[PDB]
C-alpha cells in the first residue's frame, strides 16, 4: 500500500494562488523538503530531484521502488468494509477454520 | 488445559525438566489449540526426541490430524528428523497418512531429499504409487527437485514388484491352458501335462524374485492376479502360439529391468537377471517356436490326426 | 433383395427345395428387413435345421442383432430347439449376447425350463452371474418359474467355482506369510519353511477340485486372486492366529458345500468332500491351535526367547 502524504487546500479558501505558490515554489522544491527533513524526514518524497538527493540512503531507494511497484491506497469509504472483510479472511486462513477459497469468497461479498 | 499451554511452551522451547515436572504434576498430554496443534506436534517440529518419548509414554495421540491434515509424522518428515520418524513408526503412526493435498510423508521426504527417512518409510509399507491432487507420485516429486538417487530407488522397487506380479500372472494362464486340455471334448493328456509343468516353473520364477528382494532389504508388495484372457482355447496350435506370445512379453519386460539396473549401477542385479532369467527365456522361446512350426507342417488345426500324433510323439 | 424376400417366405415356411433353388440362383443371404429380421432369424424361429445349415454354408451372419437385440441364438433358446442351438454355437455364436433387457440366452433357457439347452450353453462358457435390468441372474429366473433342477445345477456350479477360488486365495496368503519370516529383521527360518509348505498344500487342494470338476463334465471358470490383507505380519503368534482364522473360514465354506450337495442328491460329491477335505481341515485346526497355545504359554510375543526356541524345537 502506497500511502501518500499530500497537502490539501481547503475548498472554502479564497487564498488559492498564495498557497499554490507556497506549495510549488517553496515546499515541493529541494530546499523546502530539505528544511522539513532536517527535523523529521519524509522517506520517499514526490519531487524527482529531491528523490535523487535522498536516494543515496538505500532505505529511501527501497521505499520508492516498493512505492512505484505497489498499489495506491483507495480514497473510497467501501475500503472500510474491506478492512472488515478480508481481515476475517486471514482469520479463517491462518487459523484454518475455513480454506483459502472459502475465506476469500467470504471476504468477496 | 490448565497445564496444557505450559506443555505447549516447553514443546516450542524443548525443556525435558519442565515436562518432567509437568508429568510429576500430571499435566494433560492431549492439549489441542484452536487449530489442532498438540504438544506432540511441536515436539516433532522442534526435533528433541526426549519430549516426544515421554509424551508417548503418557499416551499422547500419534495420529492427531490438524486442520490442514498434518500429523507429527508429516512434520517430522518435512524437517528431516530421523529418530523421531523411527519412534513414531514404532508407536503405530500411519505411514500412508494423507494431508489436505493428499501428500503422504513419503511425498515430503522425496520432495526434500532425505534418503534415510525415505528408506525407513519404505520399510514400514509406504505406498510408492500414491498420487496427490496434481497426480504426482513421490517419484515425480523426486525428479522435479533433482533427487536422482531417491528416484532410482523408487523406480527399481516398482519395477521388481511388477516383475513379481507378471511371473505370478503367467503361472495362472498356464493353469487355465492345462485344465482346458483334459476336458472330455479335448482329450489330449500330454498337452495338459506340459502346461501344468510350465505353471509350476513360473511359480518358481516368482519365488526366486521374492527371495532376491528379501536379500537386498527391499519391500515386497503384492497386487491382484488377474484372470487369463480366455477360458476356451481352441486347439493345440492356438494355445502354443499364445504361450509363445506370452513368453516374448515376459522376456521384453526382463530386458527393460536389466537396462534399468544398468543405469542404477547395480552389477549384482544385472548378474542375477542374466544368470537365472535371460537364458531360460531364450530356451523357452526356441522350444515353443519349434512346436508351432512342427504343428503347422503336420497340418493342424484342421487335421485332428496331427494333434493326436504330436501329443504322442513329441509331448509323450 | 431381389430374392431376399423369396428367402424370407421360405424361411417362414420351411422349404429346403426352395432355398436350394435360390442358392442355385445365388440368392443373397443377408436380406435384412426394416426391423433387422434376417432369413437366419426366421430359420431359427421355425426350427428346421436344414435351412439354417445351408444359410451358414453360404455365409449368413450368425450374430446379427435386430432392433430389439435378439440374435438367432436368443430365439433358438426361447423356443427350445436344441440342434440349431448346437450348430449356432459351432459356427461362432456369442454365448453371452445381451438383448435390450440385458437377458442372455441362458436367461431365456432358465426362464422356460429347457435343461439340455442350459447344459450346452454352460459347456460353451455362458456366464452364470449375468444380471438383467432387474438384477436377476438365471438362477433367480429358474427359481421364480419352478425349474428346480436347473437351479440346482446353477447353484452347485457356482459353489464349486467359488471353492476353487478360495483355495487359490489361501495359498497366496501363506506365500506372503512365508516370505515375511525371512526378512533380515525377522530371522526365523523354520517359520518361513512351514508356511511355504502350507502354500504348496493349498495349491494341491485347488488342483484336486479342478480335476473333480473336469471328471463330472462341469465348467471351470477362474476369477481374480486378491492380495492378502497384510504385507507385514507382526510376530509368530500373530501369524499363527491369522492362519487359524483362515483355516476355520475354509472349513465353514466346505461344510456349506456339503450341505448343498446333500440337498441336490449327489452322493459322489459328498463322499469326495468328506474323504479328501473334511479330515484334513480338522487336523490343521488342531495343529494350529496347539501352536497358538504353546506360543502363548512360553511368553510370546513380548519374549523374543520364546519364538526363537519354538522355531528350534517345534518347527525344527
UniProtKB/Swiss-Prot annotation, chains B, C:
Compartment annotation: Cytoplasm; Lysosome; Cytoplasmic vesicle, Autophagosome
A GO molecular function held by the record: iron ion sequestering activity
GO cellular component, as recorded: autolysosome; autophagosome; cytoplasm; cytosol; extracellular exosome; extracellular region; ferritin complex; ficolin-1-rich granule lumen
Similarity remark: Belongs to the ferritin family.
Keywords: Acetylation, Cytoplasm, Cytoplasmic vesicle, Iron, Iron storage, Lysosome, Metal-binding, Neurodegeneration, Oxidoreductase, Phosphoprotein
EC number: 1.16.3.1
Annotated Fe cation 1 binding sites: 167, 202, 205
Organism, as annotated: Homo sapiens
Subunit structure: Oligomer of 24 subunits. There are two types of subunits: L (light) chain and H (heavy) chain. The major chain can be light or heavy, depending on the species and tissue type. In the human liver, the heavy chain is predominant. The functional molecule forms a roughly spherical shell with a diameter of 12 nm and contains a central cavity into which the insoluble mineral iron core is deposited. Interacts with NCOA4; NCOA4 promotes targeting of the iron-binding ferritin complex to autolysosomes following starvation or iron depletion.
Catalytic activity: 4 Fe(2+) + O2 + 4 H(+) = 4 Fe(3+) + 2 H2O
Residue intervals of the Ferritin-like diiron domain: 159-299
InterPro entries per the UniProt record, alphabetical: Ferritin (IPR001519), Ferritin-like (IPR012347), Ferritin-like_diiron (IPR009040), Ferritin-like_SF (IPR009078), Ferritin_CS (IPR014034), Ferritin_DPS_dom (IPR008331)
A Pfam family: Ferritin
Protein name, per record: Ferritin heavy chain
Gene Ontology BP terms: immune response; intracellular iron ion homeostasis; iron ion transport; negative regulation of cell population proliferation; negative regulation of ferroptosis; negative regulation of fibroblast proliferation
Site feature Essential for association with cargo receptor NCOA4, where: 162
Record flagged with keyword Acetylation: yes
Residues where Fe cation 2 binds: 202, 247, 281
SUPFAM superfamilies: Ferritin-like
Disease annotated for this entry: Hemochromatosis 5: A disorder of iron metabolism characterized by iron overload. Excess iron is deposited in a variety of organs leading to their failure, and resulting in serious illnesses including cirrhosis, hepatomas, diabetes, cardiomyopathy, arthritis, and hypogonadotropic hypogonadism. Severe effects of the disease usually do not appear until after decades of progressive iron loading.
